[PDB]
Amino acid sequence: NSAAIEEQANSSIRKLYHTLNTTSMADRISQISAYFKGTKYILGSLGEGPNARYDQFPRYRVDGFDCDTYVNTVLSLALANSLESFQECLKHTRYKNGKRSYINRNHFTSIDWNNYNQKRGLLKDITFSIRNEKKQPVALYANALINKPQWYNHKTIDTIRLQKQDKNEQEKRLVELKAKGKTLETSLSNVPYIPFTALFSENKPNLHLFSQIPNGAVIEIIRPNWDLRQQIGTELDISHLGFAIWINNELFFRQASSQYGKVVDVSLIDYLDKARSSPTIKGINIQVVLPEKPVCQLF
């Protein structure tokens, strides 16, 4: 019941702001992200809302998150001062030019979300600014050829999420959606990342590099050579994301975790050390939020 879920969120968010409106943007992000720790993981938490054509999951919620919706929700709350401005900020962060539709949703972290949110002045990629002791960057470039029409072509009825179950209506709407998807663009990503070969040079954590990751930064997990063409219809470059949060002079990765089943804090060093054994995960991208005070289309 998407309308009911949103109504619960309206009440909780209104109250949140009453507390907040009585600090730096990084501290806002830390406080708001912390407020949702322990909230359950829901894969694909958000859609286009009640009565939506393709995906009738709620537009926002406070009862569950996936990695993407957690970051989007926290950022939009941090950027705003009210339920009304949050709604506007979220719309403009989740969708290209804030125009609500399935195809306008920022589905791909690199070529949609990073690109559009950088262009409008919300985010800045600072990956290359994290330099070794000789003041030289250690970052590399990950590329994936993101083929939207092939990604659409690979979709099943599971994409079509209707509140009232109707399998035939799912089939109809899927053909309609794919017809639009066929007209979309193909984009080669260019995603800076700090490689594990640097972060764990000599098989130990590179504390000099880790110390340059700012509190409240957005951390994306990068897989440079990730061929998901047979599985989802496209190569991909980014598999997960969350926030960098410093607590007691230790760096945490705060994120909505499918493994833990909830929003958790985990040591970023330990998390990445375990991720090293992956054949496809090769490093991290770091972005910071530019707006200094809360207010939402452009900055």
TrEMBL record:
The keyword Coiled coil applies. Keywords: Coiled coil, Signal. It comes from the Bacteria. The keyword Coiled coil applies. Residues 160-187 form a coiled coil. SUPFAM superfamilies: Cysteine proteinases (SSF54001). Disulfide bonds join 89-296. It holds the Pfam family AmiA-like. This is DUF1460 domain-containing protein. It comes from Legionella pneumophila subsp. pneumophila (strain Philadelphia 1 / ATCC 33152 / DSM 7513).
